[PDB]
């Protein structure tokens with residue numbers, strides 16, 4: 001059985017619950033099938049295959065799915081896509097992502113790279129074939145990748161072209177770092193929140209990230225700086241928790257000084273009603289946050305970085321956190337997968 005590289009229309013599988021009102025469950029109930037009860041990958045003996053996580057149509061297909069899911073599930077009170085102003089009801093929803101499997105139709109298979117040091121591009125020497133990917137949670141965020149999978153050996157640097165500073169860098173961690181975010185109790189500032197992180201763990205992992213980046217940039221000095229301009233979605237770590245949009249200041253995470261800084265790091269945050277959408281250009285206005293304690297505990301599993309340009313003539317490389325193109329979030333999980341057509 002031989003194959004060739006090809007794109008095709010995939011379908012999706014999930015474990016959505018019948019009567020759950022959570023928006024991810026409802027969308028999967030009507031747009032996905034139940035997950036494969038007996039999956040078994042086929043190892044391809046002595047096969048080496050090339051992959052390119054930055055040129056992978058699975059990413060675009062997942063992007064279209066998550067756009068469609070958010071479009072049917074989140075209802076803003078006011079939607080402003082340039083000039084036009086749509087007003088409607090904005091009930092609060094139940095929101096928590098569930099795993100989605102992407103699967104091939106007849107005549108196609110997914111090749112899976114099992115190399116534990118695979119960086120996302122180039123050859124792979126331990127290859128298997130599957131009918132479906134694993135369950136991928138579609139977490140929308142900027143700056144930090146949340147609730148993903150971990151690199152199995154070392155910290156992995158991913159980029160389409162590291163020399164080109166316009167190309168985003170995905171840092172894939174091998175040890176997750178918890179981020180615990182709370183909008184407490186109540187009143188009438190209901191938007192003020194905070195995220196707590198173990199500073200010992202975070203600064204240890206950041207140290208390891210800098211050393212790994214030194215390996216790629218001629219043992220140069222590595223400097224982290226906060227973003228340099230942009231809207232709040234770019235300059236802040238943005239994510240959705242229980243349907244509410246949190247914006248968190250990550251200045252204390254990207255400080256090169258760390259000494260007397262081994263305690264809990266408290267990130268100031270705020271819940272925003274007016275957000276610049278990631279699906280398409282436009283603003284959306286939601287209703288004020290629900291009452292009660294709003295809390296999310298997540299795993300930081302990767303970091304999105306942009307390297308500063310114009311530093312060739314210096315001894316430093318400066319890196320800033322940088323989300324915005326949600327495709328890279330899906331890429332960080334689909335990197336090991338590629339679709340081929342069974343000849």
Ligand SMILES: NCC(=O)N1CCN(C(=O)N2C[C@H](CO)C[C@H](C(=O)Nc3ccc(Cl)c(F)c3)C2)CC1
Nearest residue numbers: 140141142231233238239240276277278280281324
């Ligand atoms: N047309 C194809 C395309 O690629 N895009 C369409 C338009 N986009 C955009 O304008 N921005 C800029 C905007 C700031 O100005 C922030 C956008 C963004 O990340 N928002 C965002 C919202 C909520 C959450 Cl929870 C989140 F984590 C992120 C990217 C998205 C990119």
Ligand SMILES: *[C@@H]1O[C@H](CO)[C@@H](O)[C@H](O)[C@H]1NC(C)=O
Nearest residue numbers: 041113114115116126127128
């Ligand atoms: C290939 O990958 C598998 C995981 O699917 C794992 O046992 C190991 O990393 C490799 N095994 C062999 C026999 O090469």
Ligand SMILES: *[C@@H]1O[C@H](CO)[C@@H](O)[C@H](O)[C@H]1NC(C)=O
Nearest residue numbers: 119121122123157158159162
């Ligand atoms: C990934 O590995 C390939 C070798 O297969 C190499 O050519 C490429 O530059 C690597 N990229 C990074 C970011 O390490």
Ligand SMILES: *[C@@H]1O[C@H](CO)[C@@H](O)[C@H](O)[C@H]1NC(C)=O
Nearest residue numbers: 147148150175176297298299
């Ligand atoms: C967080 O990470 C731990 C180990 O790193 C893992 O066991 C746990 O399932 C992760 N939590 C989530 C929500 O993925």
Ligand SMILES: *[C@@H]1O[C@H](CO)[C@@H](O)[C@H](O)[C@H]1NC(C)=O
Nearest residue numbers: 153154155156174175208212
């Ligand atoms: C993670 O990777 C780094 C190298 O980048 C290594 O020093 C460290 O020991 C690894 N941690 C684990 C838990 O494997």
Ligand SMILES: *[C@@H]1O[C@H](CO)[C@@H](O)[C@H](O)[C@H]1NC(C)=O
Nearest residue numbers: 160161162163164165166167
């Ligand atoms: C990578 O980027 C650098 C700088 O933009 C460029 O000189 C080089 O040709 C690029 N390599 C590829 C394969 O595009």
Ligand SMILES: *[C@@H]1O[C@H](CO)[C@@H](O)[C@H](O)[C@H]1NC(C)=O
Nearest residue numbers: 178180181182196295296297
């Ligand atoms: C998260 O933080 C809240 C308040 O700061 C605390 O009550 C809760 O126990 C924390 N949970 C974890 C898992 O750290």
Ligand SMILES: *[C@@H]1O[C@H](CO)[C@@H](O)[C@H](O)[C@H]1NC(C)=O
Nearest residue numbers: 198199200201202262263264
């Ligand atoms: C913080 O991280 C360190 C090292 O990972 C760990 O020993 C400690 O239990 C964690 N929690 C606190 C409260 O220090």
Ligand SMILES: *[C@@H]1O[C@H](CO)[C@@H](O)[C@H](O)[C@H]1NC(C)=O
Nearest residue numbers: 232235236249250251252268
């Ligand atoms: C984050 O906090 C620092 C001070 O703690 C402040 O200077 C900075 O403006 C804040 N970030 C944003 C995007 O407002």
Ligand SMILES: *[C@@H]1O[C@H](CO)[C@@H](O)[C@H](O)[C@H]1NC(C)=O
Nearest residue numbers: 139146147239240296297298
């Ligand atoms: C990460 O997973 C935990 C457990 O499933 C969940 O409570 C949390 O809300 C998730 N975080 C995000 C940002 O989806």
Ligand SMILES: *[C@@H]1O[C@H](CO)[C@@H](O)[C@H](O)[C@H]1NC(C)=O
Nearest residue numbers: 163164165309310311312313
């Ligand atoms: C900066 O780096 C790029 C890619 O490595 C190179 O093409 C360019 O000549 C360098 N310096 C300047 C001043 O352009």
